[PDB]
């Protein structure tokens, strides 16, 4: 008794991750064979505009010729190696040099992983290693924010600030979640945005005092929270929090897995938000989704401190088999060049006003609580009643209903909580942006007619 | 002040992993540009026989035309996508079907990752998730062995059984390490191999009784410990320990990252050691080193149990951006076919007797305590005195000296503790095997003459 169809074969042998099981059993798996620009095509020849760039990562679309050619050229040249035991590829050396150049740091060091989750798990281990070598082995606690998304390893999931991780008995101890700087949701009745920011700065100081400054290893922040629902921080957030972190000597890590390489309208989200971190975590767009790469980019201060610590023990006992893979490195070098120098990053800057203008129009609807975002990352929040910010009952699954209707209309978008997220490829044309909105608006009309 | 040479550029921008820093500063980074069969070629045009397959993974060598062509063919077809939110590529469905087929399981499910570390971290989360869903949230402890290597995330590093992880303040609580089944090292004076295995089985039962079976989530084992120094278990080990684990309702996981796809002389190390695990962890050879892929392959029992638990919460909140990437799946499908059907796994079986006969002759030297291994994974243990099994002082760095001397002779091998490991590509000919040993023997003569 064996499955025949693509859908039945997918259900027979897969253990689905991040998949709504009632929707999958009703609809079946979407099995994808190829793409063209920002579109994907399934086994039945149905085409969909992927307004999420797959998982925010396919910024140059699904059939980019330059990137396809660069990947093919490296398989022909040198198809695989590692970057451990004093060896690495020429591609690895070139990418480390390029990443330091394009980072906001004047100098630094790069460590590779396959994923953003491994890179955050790596940065945590690096802090534990460094602080212990410096005589502060108790400096282990990691500060992140509620609604932050840092990954899926036990450590990077512990950094992630969502109730869903309770199914794993996570977070592990030592992982502290601060208030999410989403003013619309977390600002209290009668609390101004200025007071909200002052409260988060106070809450951080109280946390450092109650935990003990000598017990805190680092602070990680996505400049704009991505997978958490596209959450630009409340005005003045970083200007209020960063001096508190610097005062208590707590390293600042910018998780640039989503914001890195152009989505916020600048090469880095930390540049958009005008702050210089001690380290950067990069993945996703790093290869435009063509290869699994992650990177820890260490600024001058942490590089020098880790270098001293590594020299004293004579080795850094950490790494992954494919870290610094020559194919991944050649692909990243091309992705960086394509985004920065072939007009993709500029296109996000060019089209962001038109993107916001349309969302502002959509937000006039009685069932849209707000629109939020920047550059090419945006979200629309659904509400039952606007004035009170009352959401629809969780059992109505409004966001999944919108995303499913979108799929039926030939549009892929990302549902999260009571929100619908749009993070389309940087190659999106004005006509394709209109197509994305026309389909989304049709889906919103359908769903809200059913639930309101 | 900018670096000029490849070696200087590597040192300026890299944060080195698994690299002995005193040797790196003395020798410089070996910067690799391409390879040919089992050989790698550096920027200076020097060629080395890589008798470690890179990091055990490059079993088809460094320029395999079939694999290069399969990689190129998939980049032209569909160069990137994910396997989340009820979508995946046709290549993902084909690979999951193929992996269940080639696994020792009659049926099951596959979950993808990029690495073996993420796959072990994933299996641990799956166990915590499952046991809590089945009414036992206290069922969280993970059993591994001393000298085991399971990866580099904080959790897979806690599963790993090496003192070097103390630099990170690891292992985390709940990671229990059993005696390594290395008879030569851990066997007591006057203890026979049968008594040694009986003792290991008694220690396991006492550990279970003292920890409480209701608190133990699972047991992981590499059939042959690979990165830990090539350690085949003492005779009858799995036959003694598995009934105990089965009696106490402790899931058995075979870490097949190194043993999967041919290195022990069978498709799986669990086949070579005649046991059926509840799940398999695969990575490394899965793609012959051409793309970062990891996989959790769940047997019928855990597949059914996890599906029931996931259905109750409607969504399994876990996954990685590149999990089930179409390119990695197309490459894995080719790598499995190349290894199983193009004579590579058979070449391991063909040449394993000749491999062992030469190691047996080398082990006659007074400074070789033992040779150990199976198929295409072997190790030589260095000793100051054979009769008393006394090693050379740690400060002499004997294994490192042999490895460095091998590099100077055009041979790459793997040093670990007091041992030197050989894990060559499956494409190795008899002449290349002879070249491997001729170079190793000269390195052994040089090091032992200076040190003994
Ligand atoms: Na720079
Ligand atoms: Na099978």
TrEMBL record, chains A, B:
Keywords, sorted A to Z: Aminotransferase, Pyridoxal phosphate, Pyruvate, Transferase
UniProt keyword Chloroplast present: no
Pfam families listed in its UniProt record: Aminotran_3
GO molecular function: adenosylmethionine-8-amino-7-oxononanoate transaminase activity; pyridoxal phosphate binding
GO biological process: biotin biosynthetic process; gamma-aminobutyric acid metabolic process
Cofactor(s) recorded in Swiss-Prot or TrEMBL: pyridoxal 5'-phosphate
Signal sequence range: none
Domain of life: Bacteria
Recorded family membership: Belongs to the class-III pyridoxal-phosphate-dependent aminotransferase family.
PANTHER family attached to this UniProt entry: ADENOSYLMETHIONINE-8-AMINO-7-OXONONANOATE AMINOTRANSFERASE
Stated name of the protein: Pyruvate transaminase
UniProt organism field: Vibrio fluvialis
Taxonomic placement: Bacteria, Pseudomonadati, Pseudomonadota, Gammaproteobacteria, Vibrionales
């Amino acid at each position: 008794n064996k499955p025949q169809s693509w859908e039945a074969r997918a259900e027979t042998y897969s253990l689905y991750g991040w998949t709504d099981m009632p929707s999958l059993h009703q609809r079946g798996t979407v099995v994808v064979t190829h793409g063209e620009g920002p579109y994907i095509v399934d086994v039945n020849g149905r085409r969909y505009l992927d307004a999420n760039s797959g998982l925010f990562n396919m910024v140059a679309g699904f059939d980019h010729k330059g990137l396809i050619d660069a990947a093919k050229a490296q398989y022909e040249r040198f198809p695989g190696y590692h970057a451990a035991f004093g060896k690495m590829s020429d591609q690895t050396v070139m990418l480390s040099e390029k990443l330091v150049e394009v980072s906001p740091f004047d100098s630094g060091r790069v460590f590779y992983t396959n994923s953003g989750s491994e890179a955050n798990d790596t940065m945590v281990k690096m802090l534990w290693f460094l602080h212990a070598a410096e005589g502060k082995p108790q400096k282990r606690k990691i500060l992140t924010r509620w609604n932050a998304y840092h990954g899926a390893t036990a450590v990077s999931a512990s950094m992630t600030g969502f109730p869903y991780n309770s199914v794993f008995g996570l977070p592990l101890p030592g992982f502290v979640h601060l208030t999410c700087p989403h003013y619309w949701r977390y600002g209290e009745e009668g609390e101004t945005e200025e007071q909200f920011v002052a409260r988060l700065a106070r809450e951080l100081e109280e946390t450092i005092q109650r935990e003990g400054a000598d017990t805190i290893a680092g602070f990680f922040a996505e400049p704009v929270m991505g997978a958490g629902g596209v959450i630009p921080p409340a005005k003045g957030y970083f200007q209020a929090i960063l001096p508190i972190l610097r005062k208590y000597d707590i390293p600042v890590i910018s998780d640039e897995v989503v914001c890195g390489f152009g989505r916020t309208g600048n090469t880095w989200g930390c540049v958009t938000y005008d702050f210089t971190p001690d380290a950067i975590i990069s993945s996703k767009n790093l290869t435009a989704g063509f290869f699994p790469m992650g990177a820890v980019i260490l600024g001058p201060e942490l590089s020098k401190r880790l270098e001293t610590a590594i020299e004293a023990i004579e080795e850094f006992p950490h790494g992954f088999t494919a870290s610094g893979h020559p194919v991944g490195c050649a692909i990243a070098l091309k992705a960086i060049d394509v985004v920065m120098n072939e007009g993709l990053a500029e296109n996000v800057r060019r089209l962001a006003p038109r993107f916001e203008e349309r969302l502002k129009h959509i937000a006039e609807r009685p069932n849209i609580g707000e629109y939020r975002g920047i550059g090419f990352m945006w979200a629309l929040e659904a509400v039952k009643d606007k004035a009170s910010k009352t959401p629809f009952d969780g059992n109505l699954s409004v966001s999944e209903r919108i995303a499913n209707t979108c799929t039926d209309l030939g549009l892929i978008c990302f549902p999260l909580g009571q929100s619908v997220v749009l993070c389309p490829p940087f190659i999106l044309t004005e006509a394709q942006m209109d197509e994305m909105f026309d389909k989304l608006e049709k889906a919103l009309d359908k769903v809200f007619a059913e639930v309101a």
